[PDB]
Amino acid sequence: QVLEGLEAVRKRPGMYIGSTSERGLHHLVWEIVDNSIDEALAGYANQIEVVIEKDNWIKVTDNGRGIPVDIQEKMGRPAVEVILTSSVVNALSQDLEVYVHRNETIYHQAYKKGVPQFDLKEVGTTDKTGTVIRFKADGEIFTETTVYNYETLQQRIRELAFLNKGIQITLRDERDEENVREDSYHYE
Ligand SMILES: Nc1nc2ccccc2[nH]1
Ligand SMILES: [Mg+2]
């Protein structure tokens, strides 16, 4: 059960993500980015964008197939809900949002500490496929710092692009609207 899983992750977060230090905070980004890379290596995505948003929200966008939304056999819930309510990133985020572009439709769900706040809802239409995940790390868990280091993200994003040639991976810092930094990596 999903609620018992959320309890277990939040009780011993370091056993899942290594630590709750600044290292563990950045690990949240890598968990999400690794899923986008998996989708690229499977043959379905080639562009990943990581944005550090105002108040240290992280937004990760990919142009994969979109996390499936079909009503699943096990849970009787949309697949995306099942997948995200078992995500360690969701459990350790005070807030998380997903937008799935799939079936020419945009689907949205939001969560707090892993708990869905409402049922998956159709919010719009689209001519693309892919997934947007936005999350705010839980300061109750990450007690040292919740502020991302641009250089730390940049170094690993550049490395990921070099290791997975053909994937365009972009990093953008929007925390200061007057001074926005972007680096874009695409190895050939
Ligand atoms: N593309 C993608 N990104 C994801 C993030 C969390 C769970 C599944 C995912 N699939
Ligand atoms: Mg994964």
- Is residue 50 within 8 Å of 81, Cβ to Cβ? no
Interstrand relation of 168-173 and 47-53 (parallel, antiparallel or unpaired):
parallel
Q: What atom in ligand 1 is closest to the CA of residue 39?
A: 1
> Which pair of structure tokens corresponds to residue 57?
């929200």
Cα(83)–Cα(91) distance, integer angstroms: 12
Q: Mention every residue, 6+ apart, whose C-beta is less than 8 A from residue 137.
A: 25, 28, 56, 58, 92, 93, 94, 146
- The C-alpha atoms of residue 159 and residue 181 are separated, in whole angstroms, by 18
Q: Say which residue the tokens 């693309």 belong to.
A: 128
Q: Return residues with CB closer than 5 A to ligand 2 (ion).
A: 34-35
**Cβ < 6 A, ligand 1 pocket:** 32, 35-36, 39, 62, 64, 67, 83, 87, 131, 133
Residue 157, CB-side half-sphere exposure with 13 Å CA sphere? 26
Q: Residue 36: nearest ligand to its CA? A: 1
Distance 179 CA to ligand 2 centre (A): 32
How many Cβ atoms are within 10 Å of 122's Cβ, its own excluded?
11
Phi, psi (degrees; rounded to nearest 5) at 50: -115, 120
3-state secondary structure the chain: CHHHHHHHHHHCHHHHHCCCCHHHHHHHHHHHHHHHHHHHHCCCCCEEEEEEEHHHEEEEEECCCCCCCCECCCCCCEHHHHHHHCCHHHHCEEEEEEEEEECCEEEEEEEECCEECCCCEEEEECCCCEEEEEEEECCCCCCCCCCCCHHHHHHHHHHHHHHCCCCEEEEEECCCCCCCEEEEEECC
User: Within 10 Å of residue 60's Cβ, how many Cβ atoms?
Assistant: 20
- Which of 107, 131, 167 to probe ligand 1 with, by most ligand atoms within 8 A of CB? 131
Multiple choice CATH, 1-188, 3.40.190.170, 3.30.565.10, 3.90.1150.10, 3.10.129.10: 3.30.565.10
State which ligand 1 atom lies nearest to the alpha carbon of 84. Answer: 7
| Residue 30: closest CA among 127, 135, 141 | 135
Q: Give the whole-angstrom CA distance, residue 26 versus residue 33.
A: 11
Q: Which residues are registered as beta bridge partners of 172?
A: 51, 182
Atom 9 of ligand 1: nearest residue by CA position: 35
β partners of residue 112:
115
**What distance in angstroms lies between residue 160's CA and the mean position of ligand 2's atoms?**
15
Q: What value, to the nearest 5°, has the Cα angle with vertex 18 and ends 14 and 23?
A: 110
Burial environment of residue 102 by CB neighbours within 10 A (0 to 12, 13 to 18, 19 or more): buried
From 127, 138, 67, select the one nearest 99 (Cα to Cα). Answer: 67
- Residue 167 alpha carbon to ligand 2 centre in Å: 17
User: In angstroms, rounded to a whole number, what is the distance separating the alpha carbons of residues 179 and 159?
Assistant: 25
C-alpha separations of 171 from 53, 124, 174, 177, 180 in Å: 11, 26, 10, 15, 11
Name the token pair of 187. Answer: 């190895």
Residue 127 burial (CB count, 10 A):
6
